[PDB]
mmCIF file of all heavy atoms in Angstrom:
data_model
loop_
_atom_site.group_PDB
_atom_site.id
_atom_site.type_symbol
_atom_site.label_atom_id
_atom_site.label_comp_id
_atom_site.label_asym_id
_atom_site.label_seq_id
_atom_site.Cartn_x
_atom_site.Cartn_y
_atom_site.Cartn_z
ATOM 1 N N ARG G 1 34.305 6.873 -28.857
ATOM 2 C CA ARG G 1 34.786 7.325 -27.556
ATOM 3 C C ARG G 1 33.873 6.772 -26.473
ATOM 4 O O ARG G 1 32.691 6.520 -26.715
ATOM 5 C CB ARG G 1 34.810 8.855 -27.485
ATOM 6 C CG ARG G 1 35.697 9.497 -28.556
ATOM 7 C CD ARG G 1 35.815 10.986 -28.327
ATOM 8 N NE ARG G 1 34.583 11.684 -28.695
ATOM 9 C CZ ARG G 1 34.420 13.004 -28.654
ATOM 10 N NH1 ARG G 1 35.405 13.783 -28.228
ATOM 11 N NH2 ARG G 1 33.260 13.546 -29.027
ATOM 12 N N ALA G 2 34.454 6.516 -25.305
ATOM 13 C CA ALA G 2 33.705 6.112 -24.118
ATOM 14 C C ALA G 2 34.187 6.924 -22.926
ATOM 15 O O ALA G 2 35.378 7.195 -22.801
ATOM 16 C CB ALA G 2 33.874 4.636 -23.787
ATOM 17 N N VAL G 3 33.250 7.268 -22.043
ATOM 18 C CA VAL G 3 33.517 7.944 -20.790
ATOM 19 C C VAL G 3 33.032 7.033 -19.664
ATOM 20 O O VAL G 3 31.887 6.554 -19.699
ATOM 21 C CB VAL G 3 32.815 9.318 -20.730
ATOM 22 C CG1 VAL G 3 32.922 9.923 -19.336
ATOM 23 C CG2 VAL G 3 33.391 10.285 -21.793
ATOM 24 N N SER G 4 33.911 6.760 -18.696
ATOM 25 C CA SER G 4 33.531 6.060 -17.465
ATOM 26 C C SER G 4 33.257 7.065 -16.346
ATOM 27 O O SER G 4 34.083 7.943 -16.085
ATOM 28 C CB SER G 4 34.623 5.086 -17.020
ATOM 29 O OG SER G 4 34.783 4.008 -17.936
ATOM 30 N N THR G 5 32.098 6.938 -15.697
ATOM 31 C CA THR G 5 31.655 7.969 -14.748
ATOM 32 C C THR G 5 32.119 7.718 -13.310
ATOM 33 O O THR G 5 31.946 8.605 -12.487
ATOM 34 C CB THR G 5 30.128 8.155 -14.791
ATOM 35 O OG1 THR G 5 29.457 6.931 -14.444
ATOM 36 C CG2 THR G 5 29.673 8.608 -16.199
ATOM 37 N N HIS G 6 32.728 6.577 -12.993
ATOM 38 C CA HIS G 6 33.554 6.432 -11.787
ATOM 39 C C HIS G 6 34.332 5.128 -11.937
ATOM 40 O O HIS G 6 34.250 4.463 -12.973
ATOM 41 C CB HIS G 6 32.766 6.513 -10.468
ATOM 42 C CG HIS G 6 31.775 5.416 -10.213
ATOM 43 N ND1 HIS G 6 30.519 5.410 -10.776
ATOM 44 C CD2 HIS G 6 31.822 4.327 -9.398
ATOM 45 C CE1 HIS G 6 29.844 4.356 -10.348
ATOM 46 N NE2 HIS G 6 30.607 3.684 -9.511
ATOM 47 N N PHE G 7 35.117 4.781 -10.912
ATOM 48 C CA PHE G 7 36.168 3.781 -11.046
ATOM 49 C C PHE G 7 35.713 2.348 -10.791
ATOM 50 O O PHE G 7 36.543 1.454 -10.890
ATOM 51 C CB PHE G 7 37.335 4.102 -10.090
ATOM 52 C CG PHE G 7 37.032 3.824 -8.632
ATOM 53 C CD1 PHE G 7 37.473 2.651 -8.024
ATOM 54 C CD2 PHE G 7 36.366 4.759 -7.864
ATOM 55 C CE1 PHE G 7 37.215 2.400 -6.653
ATOM 56 C CE2 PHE G 7 36.106 4.522 -6.482
ATOM 57 C CZ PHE G 7 36.532 3.321 -5.899
ATOM 58 N N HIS G 8 34.446 2.111 -10.436
ATOM 59 C CA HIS G 8 34.006 0.754 -10.140
ATOM 60 C C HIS G 8 33.843 -0.071 -11.412
ATOM 61 O O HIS G 8 33.769 0.446 -12.530
ATOM 62 C CB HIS G 8 32.666 0.746 -9.396
ATOM 63 C CG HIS G 8 32.731 1.258 -7.993
ATOM 64 N ND1 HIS G 8 31.656 1.897 -7.394
ATOM 65 C CD2 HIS G 8 33.726 1.239 -7.080
ATOM 66 C CE1 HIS G 8 32.002 2.248 -6.163
ATOM 67 N NE2 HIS G 8 33.244 1.851 -5.948
ATOM 68 N N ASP G 9 33.694 -1.381 -11.201
ATOM 69 C CA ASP G 9 33.661 -2.334 -12.307
ATOM 70 C C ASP G 9 32.435 -2.193 -13.190
ATOM 71 O O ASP G 9 32.510 -2.550 -14.360
ATOM 72 C CB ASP G 9 33.740 -3.752 -11.767
ATOM 73 C CG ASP G 9 35.134 -4.143 -11.444
ATOM 74 O OD1 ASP G 9 35.994 -3.998 -12.339
ATOM 75 O OD2 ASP G 9 35.361 -4.585 -10.308
ATOM 76 N N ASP G 10 31.319 -1.676 -12.691
ATOM 77 C CA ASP G 10 30.170 -1.487 -13.581
ATOM 78 C C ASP G 10 30.332 -0.273 -14.484
ATOM 79 O O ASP G 10 29.441 0.023 -15.279
ATOM 80 C CB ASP G 10 28.861 -1.401 -12.776
ATOM 81 C CG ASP G 10 28.902 -0.400 -11.640
ATOM 82 O OD1 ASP G 10 29.971 0.103 -11.251
ATOM 83 O OD2 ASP G 10 27.808 -0.170 -11.114
ATOM 84 N N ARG G 11 31.476 0.413 -14.403
ATOM 85 C CA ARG G 11 31.753 1.616 -15.178
ATOM 86 C C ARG G 11 33.043 1.501 -15.985
ATOM 87 O O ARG G 11 33.097 2.032 -17.099
ATOM 88 C CB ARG G 11 31.816 2.837 -14.241
ATOM 89 C CG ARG G 11 30.666 2.940 -13.261
ATOM 90 C CD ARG G 11 29.349 3.173 -13.981
ATOM 91 N NE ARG G 11 28.207 2.568 -13.284
ATOM 92 C CZ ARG G 11 27.054 2.292 -13.885
ATOM 93 N NH1 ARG G 11 26.913 2.524 -15.176
ATOM 94 N NH2 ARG G 11 26.049 1.754 -13.219
ATOM 95 N N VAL G 12 34.076 0.824 -15.461
ATOM 96 C CA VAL G 12 35.325 0.621 -16.200
ATOM 97 C C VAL G 12 35.554 -0.823 -16.572
ATOM 98 O O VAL G 12 36.494 -1.108 -17.332
ATOM 99 C CB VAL G 12 36.562 1.133 -15.423
ATOM 100 C CG1 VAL G 12 36.473 2.609 -15.141
ATOM 101 C CG2 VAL G 12 36.809 0.291 -14.146
ATOM 102 N N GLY G 13 34.771 -1.754 -16.026
ATOM 103 C CA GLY G 13 35.023 -3.156 -16.310
ATOM 104 C C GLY G 13 34.573 -3.426 -17.734
ATOM 105 O O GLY G 13 33.385 -3.345 -18.031
ATOM 106 N N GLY G 14 35.513 -3.720 -18.616
ATOM 107 C CA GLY G 14 35.250 -3.789 -20.037
ATOM 108 C C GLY G 14 36.016 -2.769 -20.850
ATOM 109 O O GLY G 14 35.966 -2.813 -22.085
ATOM 110 N N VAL G 15 36.697 -1.830 -20.194
ATOM 111 C CA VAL G 15 37.537 -0.845 -20.877
ATOM 112 C C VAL G 15 38.580 -1.529 -21.777
ATOM 113 O O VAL G 15 38.854 -1.077 -22.903
ATOM 114 C CB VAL G 15 38.156 0.083 -19.806
ATOM 115 C CG1 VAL G 15 39.451 0.690 -20.231
ATOM 116 C CG2 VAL G 15 37.138 1.191 -19.456
ATOM 117 N N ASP G 16 39.123 -2.678 -21.352
ATOM 118 C CA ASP G 16 40.132 -3.316 -22.196
ATOM 119 C C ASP G 16 39.511 -3.868 -23.467
ATOM 120 O O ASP G 16 40.131 -3.801 -24.540
ATOM 121 C CB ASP G 16 40.880 -4.438 -21.448
ATOM 122 C CG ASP G 16 41.772 -3.929 -20.335
ATOM 123 O OD1 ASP G 16 41.969 -2.703 -20.214
ATOM 124 O OD2 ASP G 16 42.267 -4.786 -19.551
ATOM 125 N N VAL G 17 38.270 -4.379 -23.377
ATOM 126 C CA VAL G 17 37.541 -4.792 -24.578
ATOM 127 C C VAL G 17 37.296 -3.590 -25.498
ATOM 128 O O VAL G 17 37.522 -3.669 -26.714
ATOM 129 C CB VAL G 17 36.211 -5.478 -24.219
ATOM 130 C CG1 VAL G 17 35.332 -5.623 -25.500
ATOM 131 C CG2 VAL G 17 36.474 -6.837 -23.555
ATOM 132 N N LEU G 18 36.768 -2.493 -24.948
ATOM 133 C CA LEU G 18 36.570 -1.275 -25.747
ATOM 134 C C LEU G 18 37.842 -0.869 -26.475
ATOM 135 O O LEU G 18 37.834 -0.637 -27.690
ATOM 136 C CB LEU G 18 36.105 -0.119 -24.858
ATOM 137 C CG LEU G 18 34.723 -0.326 -24.194
ATOM 138 C CD1 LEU G 18 34.388 0.826 -23.252
ATOM 139 C CD2 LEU G 18 33.655 -0.489 -25.242
ATOM 140 N N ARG G 19 38.953 -0.794 -25.743
ATOM 141 C CA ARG G 19 40.232 -0.437 -26.359
ATOM 142 C C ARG G 19 40.628 -1.407 -27.463
ATOM 143 O O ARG G 19 41.058 -0.973 -28.543
ATOM 144 C CB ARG G 19 41.341 -0.344 -25.294
ATOM 145 C CG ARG G 19 42.673 -0.027 -25.925
ATOM 146 C CD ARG G 19 43.770 -0.032 -24.928
ATOM 147 N NE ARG G 19 43.477 0.911 -23.877
ATOM 148 C CZ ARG G 19 43.119 0.586 -22.637
ATOM 149 N NH1 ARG G 19 43.033 -0.680 -22.280
ATOM 150 N NH2 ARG G 19 42.875 1.551 -21.722
ATOM 151 N N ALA G 20 40.477 -2.715 -27.236
ATOM 152 C CA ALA G 20 40.812 -3.693 -28.274
ATOM 153 C C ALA G 20 39.928 -3.528 -29.500
ATOM 154 O O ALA G 20 40.332 -3.874 -30.622
ATOM 155 C CB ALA G 20 40.665 -5.124 -27.749
ATOM 156 N N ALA G 21 38.704 -3.037 -29.303
ATOM 157 C CA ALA G 21 37.791 -2.850 -30.405
ATOM 158 C C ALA G 21 38.046 -1.554 -31.162
ATOM 159 O O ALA G 21 37.418 -1.333 -32.196
ATOM 160 C CB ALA G 21 36.351 -2.860 -29.878
ATOM 161 N N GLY G 22 38.912 -0.691 -30.652
ATOM 162 C CA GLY G 22 39.201 0.578 -31.281
ATOM 163 C C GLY G 22 38.529 1.784 -30.675
ATOM 164 O O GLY G 22 38.586 2.860 -31.267
ATOM 165 N N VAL G 23 37.944 1.661 -29.499
ATOM 166 C CA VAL G 23 37.299 2.786 -28.834
ATOM 167 C C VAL G 23 38.329 3.518 -27.985
ATOM 168 O O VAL G 23 39.032 2.893 -27.184
ATOM 169 C CB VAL G 23 36.136 2.304 -27.950
ATOM 170 C CG1 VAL G 23 35.432 3.508 -27.269
ATOM 171 C CG2 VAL G 23 35.162 1.447 -28.734
ATOM 172 N N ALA G 24 38.353 4.849 -28.087
ATOM 173 C CA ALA G 24 39.184 5.674 -27.220
ATOM 174 C C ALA G 24 38.472 5.839 -25.885
ATOM 175 O O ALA G 24 37.350 6.345 -25.845
ATOM 176 C CB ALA G 24 39.445 7.040 -27.856
ATOM 177 N N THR G 25 39.102 5.420 -24.796
ATOM 178 C CA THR G 25 38.451 5.465 -23.486
ATOM 179 C C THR G 25 38.955 6.641 -22.655
ATOM 180 O O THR G 25 40.157 6.941 -22.659
ATOM 181 C CB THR G 25 38.655 4.145 -22.745
ATOM 182 O OG1 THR G 25 40.059 3.835 -22.659
ATOM 183 C CG2 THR G 25 37.942 3.002 -23.510
#
């Protein structure tokens, strides 16, 4: 699991990689 602490790119940029790797975001 991953939690993003706000909407900017240093916090969500990479969410698509995490998801492709099998991480629930």
Side-chain angles (χ1 to χ4, degrees):
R1 301 187 286 183
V3 171
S4 293
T5 60
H6 65 279
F7 73 99
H8 290 150
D9 279 307
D10 51 347
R11 312 295 148 201
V12 299
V15 154
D16 292 351
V17 168
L18 296 176
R19 178 184 303 108
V23 181
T25 55

